Ligand SMILES: *[C@@H]1O[C@H](CO)[C@@H](O[C@@H]2O[C@H](CO)[C@@H](O[C@@H]3O[C@H](CO)[C@@H](O)[C@H](O)[C@@H]3O)[C@H](O)[C@H]2NC(C)=O)[C@H](O)[C@H]1NC(C)=O
Ligand SMILES: *[C@@H]1O[C@H](CO)[C@@H](O)[C@H](O)[C@H]1NC(C)=O
């Protein structure tokens with residue numbers, strides 16, 4: 001189900017969250033397993049102080065991790081407070097898209113103000129469909145200058161206000177710069193898994209120097225600059241590559257047996273065929289699979305009736 005299944009939850013101010021100022025200790029659990037937010041998210045200081053007027057205890061920082069399943073927010077994301085023990089927004093490390101159909105002050109779709117974080121860490125963020133971005137007053141925040149926000153924007157006129165964060169020179173002098181394996185499009189943090197996009201190729205969500213084409217385990221092939229694992233029936237080749245693509249039909253050399261174009265662990269024994277009959281096969285000396293005698297309804301080890309005594 002592509003990780004967590006698609007679960008749409010209401011934003012702050014709608015439905016079960018009507019008349020709520022902020023994500024807070026009472027309502028955070030109602031975002032459990034949400035993947036899309038129909039509305040806005042607000043995270044304010046009160047969330048972490050507690051609020052006696054609304055019978056709200058202080059929010060436990062660990063529970064912010066409940067937001068790790070959020071992939072989409074259709075409105076805006078406003079973060080004006082964050083736990084002191086958290087150097088980034090890894091709660092939102094899986095957020096992919098902010099659509100910005102509603103905007104703070106009718107302007108901003110992402111706003112990150114007055115935090116102590118040292119990086120943003122929105123490592124999955126790829127699109128801010130509409131609305132401006134504001135990142136200001138984050139006195140320890142680096143890396144924000146490196147993003148080419150145009151790669152995320154999809155509307156004319158979108159703009160960033162990135163100001164009063166840690167100084168550029170200061171960030172460079174303390175080594176807070178994009179990893180060498182990042183492309184020039186910038187980064188969300190110092191790690192190779194924080195790149196907006198890769199210099200060379202990626203493996204999962206990490207940027208790397210090269211796929212395992214001729215050495216290394218497991219062997220891989222390159223699919224649109226991504227390292228994709230080779231099928232395990234493909235025998236690794238000391239000289240050659242091992243695959244031309246995915247599946248057991250794209251091996252250079254099969255590892256166990258050969259059923260036509262398929263490399264396979266064991267010759268088929270009972271699979272379904274084109275007919276009211278099951279397909280039974282056996283392996284010869286050269287580990288090629290061959291149909292068994294038709295009268296061999298429970299399989300075979302060699303050709304002929306002798307194969308099914
Ligand atoms: C923290 O989150 C909780 C839950 O999301 C918020 O609690 C909600 O607070 C509002 C008032 O602030 C309550 O709304 C009122 O409900 C009554 C009774 O149904 C209704 O007659 C009023 O018209 C109004 O809608 C709501 O019941 C309450 N819900 C729960 C589950 O407690 C809380 O306010 C949030 N606090 C902060 C500081 O963000
Ligand atoms: C999502 O919810 C299911 C139960 O509804 C739970 O088993 C699973 O652990 C949850 N996902 C995470 C990441 O906790």
Ligand SMILES: *[C@@H]1O[C@H](CO)[C@@H](O)[C@H](O)[C@H]1NC(C)=O
Nearest residue numbers: 198199200201208209210211
């Ligand atoms: C990765 O890309 C950089 C920049 O184009 C290049 O200098 C380097 O040789 C590349 N390495 C590999 C393994 O492709």
